[model samples]
Target chain A: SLKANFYKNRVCLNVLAGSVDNAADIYDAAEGHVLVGVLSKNYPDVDTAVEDMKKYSEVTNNAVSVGLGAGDPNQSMMVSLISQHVQPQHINQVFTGVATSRALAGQDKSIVNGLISPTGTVGMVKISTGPLSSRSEDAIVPVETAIAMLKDMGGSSVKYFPMGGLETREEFACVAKACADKDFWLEPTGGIDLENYEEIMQIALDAGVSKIIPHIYSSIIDKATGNTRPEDVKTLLDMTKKLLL
Target chain B: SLKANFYKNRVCLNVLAGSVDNAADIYDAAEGHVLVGVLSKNYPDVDTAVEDMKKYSEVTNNAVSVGLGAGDPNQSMMVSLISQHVQPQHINQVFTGVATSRALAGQDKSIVNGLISPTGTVGMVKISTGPLSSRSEDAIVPVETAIAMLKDMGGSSVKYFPMGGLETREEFACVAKACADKDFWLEPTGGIDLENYEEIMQIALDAGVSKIIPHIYSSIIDKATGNTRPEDVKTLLDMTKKLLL
Candidate 1:
């Protein structure tokens, strides 16, 4: 379960749903250390989303997560519909926005963890926030406030966004330090590529962060194929092991 | 202008905005043959969307077109806001949805063509439709009715979806023939990748369709970098030229 592995002081990787034909391939390639996620916008309808998730869970033994509410009305609907069908035994986590998270919390599901964003307190579960801009003023929450807020909300994680091109090293350090201070998990997302991934991961570790989940998205994809670059994923895993050593 | 090259027996490409950092690279790589679109989901604010359009227009020397609206409330707002700032001379075409096309039609702009979709009649412009599913028994419009309606509504084009994996060659041939019978343009969108792109394009051409615009989206995108694969774009362009020959 993600709960058991949340603070293992290891860098985990997450890939978008449909990034590959079979989720099991990712599991096999990453040596069962990666999380496969589904984004609502990519699927045409709720039926397809549910169908795909069932396939992934079956193939990967449920090492899958569902991401909802990226400004799509259907996405929220998808979250509600998906929640009903997803077995806790199959899905490790469901990461959602505030409203969706609240709605999911109302439902009774077994075995799955729910992770909310920004104010993780409202959902009483794990939390994630931002593609923090270079400017400190643009952060959703002040660095000083984040640690306490995360602690109060019972969140074990923070999802940092725009970690590729828009993020600056200093801002990353600030967020990492705050997470480190709180002993919270950190997942840096968006625009992350092979070029700057090491630097970003190093920052999180140097800042004393125990667990880091670096989302090596878009950069490692072969645009012509819409598939994750297996070679790059290998590089990331190898780097993670080296760093841990 | 799209009309100037609408039926030149070539496969025109259209990409979403925020798919890449610089629009000029797409234009230069496609050799001024591609349309640069802005999606509201990618832009943080309306001001940035407007500013980016202006930059794309200026950089491409007005060789680029713009697309808006795909279930985003801000996108409709973007259509209005962009209309105010965009000079007709700067943009070659304004491709929008039913609501946005109607909104833009109420405004005054020079030298730009307007294209609308789903129901092209709602906007009274050069229009587009979808990737007619084999499940047309469940489609909003009967397959036969769709072709006639597109013709009646003054539609010059149809945007066929699930054009990648969800589409069958038989269904594609049917839609292509219908469009060809009426001299309508066909734009096959969604799930298009390098592997099956040629087959889909060949289907459209063999059906006697004069012009086809196959949206090679997501498949040609490197999700890690959040950018389009220029090499893939070039490959598609080269393949299109070969198919034409």
Candidate 2:
């Protein structure tokens, strides 16, 4: 049984605003008690990465896993087993895209909430069981489990693999439209724009977005490669800021 | 006259923690009223470093200088001229090795009291001021100026570097011992060790040091490479954890 005293002494979670390597550095730097979430793409040296995990495990003595999506079940499972030193949270039967696909194969319920069954405008989900075991079951169980773990650990939010920029415009709109039809609290994780930012603000939008956080180079690409610089992204951000006003 | 209202903001001092490149990246990443201080190692990308400084100056519309010490008057001057901005409070003068060489050259006076002539422990030091100036004079002016500026900005305890290493063990011991004799308050920096830790603590005790600040890494070294890891380095940490009473 997990010791109650351990959880009591643990400090608040610090969501690393940078990459995994940076997260490791932060983990090393933090004083007192804290848990850190690593943004992927910064794991350049696998040995160092593994060593970093080992350090955290030795230091905190808790199960840990990388934030990832359900698309690559095997990869997720491997990372979970290696870092967590426990059975991987069941992704196949729950929280996986395949599970969501299967669950929505016939049902007309909202994909996000209908799968997990959120309550009220707060949209809380819980996980009482261990990680999922099979690939054929729905992904709702696993997603709910992840959220529950975050809540239990006193984390601000659950970490997940957001499929880069795809979810914002398409998946979110579909989810919003579905929720609108059902009159349920279910919300999508995409389709954010300056135009819609207000309507969502008016209605209290909830989203589970995986921001494919960029490194300096990717940040440069985000600006220069796309015929723009990261600074211009700030311009867009500023425009959106004005919209809020 | 410098406007107090304009410059009054928390300066995010990223103690480069010895990584020059990382320090530059942090400077680039800084936003919302940030001031930069690069400690220790000189950076490789000189051009990028200069450009970043120029950008910072333009953005803030202020003159700021990189800090320097350790027997290099020219380098110290370069740092001072870059950022013309000055602080309101007295700049803290920390010395080791060659910087100490500069300190030795000065006429002793109490800096804490800000007397034009020599007084007690905190008196100012007067030395020859000219091109190719004495390292002591050069260091004291800038250090004092920076401390004054920080105080004006409403801050306490600014960091001074290039200290507390095994290479400068005698220097640390001498200064610490001297302060102990004078019953003056002076914190030790640079190299420190288990053997010296007890001695230093005793010195502080004898000196009636209300607070002791000792940089921990200088006391511990890697079995290989002789450098300490950032995680292992803790400044003014609880040494009592390992104490067997």
Candidate 3:
């Protein structure tokens, strides 16, 4: 928004936009200080997602946040293309859900990462030393180690997604502490809404993350219209302002 | 077991062996034909697991089946060392759960493979394109693609683990068909026991998996002694003979 797509020393709101018009409305509501998420998941391929996101980026002053279709790791390509093809470079980023070791694979550093599982462990990780003859296998590590590994891979943020609201409050706090102590950015995603928004952001903000981008999805969208309500976004912005103060 | 450790044209049982004595007892019952699984998970490190696995491998005449240790993708090294240092090579193999690209990472070709999620997709996969500069992210594909990709990476088997017994019977059947059609070995692991063992193996056998290796953990093992009951191994072997004939 204010600092383009990637920023520090403050908060950035990531809101899912159903359409170009919807994205325009939310962008205006946040005064072009919001990162607009456009889902490639809605399209058949990257080209299709690109066609619309280019416009979303243009209209919202290129604050387009490209989606990871189905949140799959390979979709990294889609986000990369959008970041490259989108009029403004380094301003738009992607929220991803990739494995630990491969986290750095072909990704733009601006891209925010990886959806973590509820178990407080990196969703999936890999190793190559144990077996012989060209081999590797899946392994998991705690969120703390996951953050450290991501940093080692040149990552600056951690996306703790599918949080399921208060259900995973404890673990979220645990991860928040890691991000703060480790000097990483933290994005709290999934199941966030107007009611519980403040509490979720408060945790990360208070934990002292380098920067925090809270994704407010379906919970704030108008069900029938599939658009996030501008008023709700304003309220969210208000909460963020108050939190920062 | 009849084929020692690695075999074809029939099925081999991979049972969790809680103790060296437990492994020996199960081996005796299976007539040294069973693939006695010794968990690297039980011990803090691979050396400890190896210290005892050497005994298990010796007692079972090198039929020791090294485990993935908590089934993490990074534990490939543990299984590799056990496979390398184990008295015999090629006879004892590791059961793995590696990412498709890394699946071929240092793993013995004899190693059977990975645990799949209940969703019927390779649990966690990655792609190295779309972005630039040291980047990769997670992606998911169908079981068929996972099998094809694994084979492309030199894998020969698909371990559709944690089948959760009959809970995932439908998806199991779907994967069984893929394995059969794809010419891959199938290992139906997790939630397998005396009661549903026959039905589970029958599905793969009927579907025509090249060689099915069913991993019967915890369920068939005596919880108190933490050993697989030798009697159960016999009954399972009996069922296998019945199905084969």
Question: Which candidate would rank higher by lDDT, 2 or 3?
Answer: 3
- For DockQ, candidate 1 versus 3, the one ahead is 3
What CAPRI grade goes to candidate 1? incorrect
The digit string of per-residue lDDT tens for model 1 on A1-245 reads: 32222214376677654544546666677776677776656678767877877777776666666665352322543554574565422122222222223224333232232232232222121122211111112122244344443332223466654444444556667777867875777777767777777777888888898777776667877788767766776787777777778
| Alpha-carbon lDDT, every model | 0.52, 0.29, 0.61
Docking class of 3: incorrect
Worst 10 residues of 1 chain A by lDDT: A130-139
TM-score of chain A of 2: 0.32
- TM-score quality measure for candidate 2: 0.25
For each prediction in turn, the share of the native Cα contacts (below 8 Å between chains A and B) that it retains comes to 0.00, 0.00, 0.00
lDDT of 1 by residue, B169-190 (tens): 5566776786787667777766
Instruction: Tell me the tens digit of each residue's lDDT in model 3 across B34-146.
Output: 78777655677757876887887767877776666565445554554455555332222222223222322334445445444455442332222111211223333355655
The reply for model 1, stretches above 4 Å from the true place, is A1-9, A69-77, A80-84, A87-140, A150-154, B1-245
Off by over 4 Å in 3: A1-8, A69-84, A87-109, A120-139, B1-245
**Candidate ranking (TM-score, best to worst):** 3, 1, 2
Tens digit of per-residue lDDT, candidate 3, span A1-245: 22354323477788888888998999888876688887655777757776777788778887766666554544544554454455331222222222222322333445445444555433332211111211223333345555554543334567765677565788788888878877777878788888888888888877777778788888898899989999998898888777777
The most accurate candidate by TM-score is 3
